[PDB]
Design a protein around this nucleic acid. Structure first.
Ligand code: DGT
Ligand code: CA
Length: 621
DNA sequence: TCAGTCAGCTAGTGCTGAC
DNA sequence: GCGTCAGCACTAGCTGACTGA
């Protein structure tokens, strides 16, 4: 059929006879001298539909003038699949205001003159890029030898302006329906992208989704201004890239130690399960069942010193019912089983072939409070213990520099509440976490070890964020045999909140007024459906900690290009960088300066510090 | 063949890991 | 009522298919 073969030469299949094929354009010449396919069926929307196609034999040099002397532009990238490591970019879209969208067919392109102009347009810092869900596209671009410096992703602006009311969607169609008075009609049910040949309607949608971003940017730049939400948007937009680089690299694991520890812990687990079942009075029990094990404990007459019966096996509550043989074995088995199933029996299933490294997937804003989250193998969940963390190593002749913010929260709260005592203490360079570990224990500061500091962390942050005295005493008597009276905990809670008056003022003033709008130091807003004192207290401080970490990522990413270094992980408040063995001192100094000058921006009165340790293995702090 | 007696999904829980 | 999130494993219940009626 000649009808379906209308526009084959441009690598287009005329599936639908709903198209038509050149017009004079008054472009600007390099000396500042003045010098597209369409669909037959029009759309009621005012969004752009026209577009060009740039092919190997369908290139003209003067196309580059369209991007020349520009300010903002839309960009979208459609890919064959979702695995960046084993997928190739299919299409690039560029949408200039009052211009048709421009398409580079990457499969149907073999020369490099076509691409250099787009390269230069991406490079320039002064050109702001509009990309929906920028993380995906930036991942692909950095993988395929592209370098971006500026982004303005409309998902970020939408979610920040949405004030975290509904957690779902925020796709292009939902946002376009919400803010703009347009309906994109995303009826494309993921058509065949692997095939090089593409139908016309699919490309019309591909150009439409890119073109709709420009009006969205125009309107959101006004909407963000009246809300005073520009700072957080800028920080997030500039921090999109370092997440992508960190996820592109990943962290290496030595398979020999992984397999050795797997076999050893498997043998330990089997002997432990044997001992556990033998200690229990029935052999058919499936141990992992919380309800079956609850019934088993009940029929074994396991009881507390008090008149209570086993209602749950939660570790926090389980730690009280000790001094029975079976429960020590139960807890040891639970620990080993968690370590095995969560990590060791699943980590080998995640080590990518031909790379021998793990790769994760960071969630930019899925968290309520703005922290990162990992949906793929969670590198934020790998255990603390050294013997399990050593398996992570740098590449050959490389060494890690591990920097962690020293007491990042309780520095945020100090500014947000502008308390004098906390800020003076942190000028004096004293450790609040160590002091917490010492006051509720022996008074010897030098005797406080890592575990005691770790327990101090939870109690201190909880009492800052609204924990009442009954639950605090439950926690304290659980994790350390204090056996403290209720009056002792009441006195401690009051002493803390009075010796730091600003925090008590903050609690009183946020409780007295049932405000439903809360802001972070980056003006990141939220609206709660119903008041909850704990979340209300939490959100500003944690949001500011997230903002400080994101700005630190931005500054460190900018500064690290000198030494060819690369970032591999960020978890929640620390950064790991792999740098060559010759530039260790430069890497350490750069990392400390970057973290310092990121923290000193939002916090203008407390001097943040960092614990930096040059490590051969990520486990070996 | 309808009516009464049976495997797969499927959201709900409990638990633990990090910060 | 201290917060954010992700992961592993059960097991009621709904819905669906087989043995009489
Ligand atoms: N509400 C609550 N927030 C926590 C808890 N643990 C950590 N956070 C937050 C606050 C921490 O400052 C932040 C970083 O965790 P870290 O383990 O690094 O604590 P920190 O940096 O203060 O100790 P460090 O100086 O690095 O040894 O995560 C917790 O148990 N409860
Ligand atoms: Ca830290």
């Amino acid at each position: 059929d000649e009808i379906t073969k209308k526009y084959i030469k441009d690598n287009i299949i005329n599936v639908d006879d709903n198209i038509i094929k050149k017009d004079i354009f008054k472009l600007k010449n390099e000396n500042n001298e003045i010098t597209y396919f369409e669909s037959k069926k029009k759309f009621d929307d005012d969004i752009e539909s026209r577009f060009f196609i740039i092919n190997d034999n369908n290139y003209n040099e003067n196309i580059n003038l369209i991007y020349k002397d520009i300010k903002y532009c839309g960009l979208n990238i459609q890919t064959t699949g979702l695995e960046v490591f084993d997928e190739n970019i299919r299409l690039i879209q560029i949408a200039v205001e009052n211009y048709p969208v421009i398409i580079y067919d990457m499969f149907n392109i073999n020369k490099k003159d076509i691409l250099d102009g787009l390269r230069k347009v991406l490079e320039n810092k002064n050109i702001i890029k509009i990309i929906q869900n920028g993380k995906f596209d930036a991942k692909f671009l950095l993988h395929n030898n592209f370098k971006i410096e500026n982004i303005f992703d409309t998902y970020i602006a939408s979610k920040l302006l949405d004030k975290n009311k509904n957690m779902y969607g925020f796709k292009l169609n939902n946002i376009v329906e919400k803010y703009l008075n347009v309906i994109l009609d995303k009826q494309q049910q993921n058509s065949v992208w692997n095939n090089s040949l593409l139908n016309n309607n699919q490309l019309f949608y591909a150009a439409r989704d890119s073109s709709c971003l420009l009006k969205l940017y125009k309107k959101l730049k006004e909407e963000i201004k009246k809300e005073n939400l520009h700072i957080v948007n800028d920080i997030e937009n500039k921090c999109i890239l370092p997440i992508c680089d960190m996820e592109l690299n990943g962290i290496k694991v030595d398979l020999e130690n992984l397999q050795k520890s797997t076999n050893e812990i498997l043998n330990e687990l089997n002997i432990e399960k044997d001992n556990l079942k033998k200690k229990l009075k029935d052999e058919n029990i499936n141990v992992n069942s919380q309800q079956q094990v609850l019934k088993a404990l009940q029929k074994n007459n396991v009881r507390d010193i008090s008149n209570k019966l086993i209602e749950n096996t939660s570790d926090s509550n389980l730690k009280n019912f000790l001094n029975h043989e079976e429960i020590i074995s139960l807890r040891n088995y639970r620990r080993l089983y968690k370590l095995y199933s969560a990590f060791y029996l699943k980590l080998p299933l995640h080590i990518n072939t031909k790379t021998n490294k793990i790769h994760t997937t960071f969630n930019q804003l899925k968290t309520f409070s703005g922290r990162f989250s990992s949906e793929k193998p969670n590198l934020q969940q790998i255990p603390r213990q050294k013997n399990i963390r050593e398996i992570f190593i740098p590449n050959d002749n490389n060494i890690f520099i591990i920097a962690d913010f020293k007491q990042i929260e309780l520095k945020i709260a100090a500014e947000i509440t502008n308390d004098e005592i906390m800020l003076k203490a942190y000028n004096n360079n004293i450790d609040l976490h160590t002091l917490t570990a010492s006051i509720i224990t022996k008074k010897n500061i030098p005797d406080i070890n890592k575990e005691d500091r770790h327990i101090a962390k939870a109690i201190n942050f909880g009492l800052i964020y609204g924990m009442n005295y009954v639950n605090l005493k439950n926690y304290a008597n659980t994790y350390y045999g204090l056996n403290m009276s209720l009056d002792q905990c009441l006195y401690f809670y009051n002493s803390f909140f009075e010796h730091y008056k600003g925090i008590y003022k903050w609690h009183n003033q946020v409780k007295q007024k049932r405000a439903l709008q809360y802001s972070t130091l980056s003006n990141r807003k939220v609206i709660f459906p119903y008041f909850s004192f704990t979340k209300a207290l939490n959100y500003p401080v944690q949001g500011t900690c997230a903002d400080i970490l994101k700005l630190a990522l931005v500054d460190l990413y900018d500064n690290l290009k000198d030494i060819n270094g690369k970032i591999i992980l960020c978890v929640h408040d620390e950064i790991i960088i792999e740098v060559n063995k010759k530039f260790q001192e430069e890497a350490l100094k750069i990392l400390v300066q970057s973290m310092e000058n990121s923290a000193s921006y939002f916090l203008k009165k407390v001097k943040c510090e960092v614990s930096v340790k040059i490590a051969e293995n990520w486990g070996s702090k």
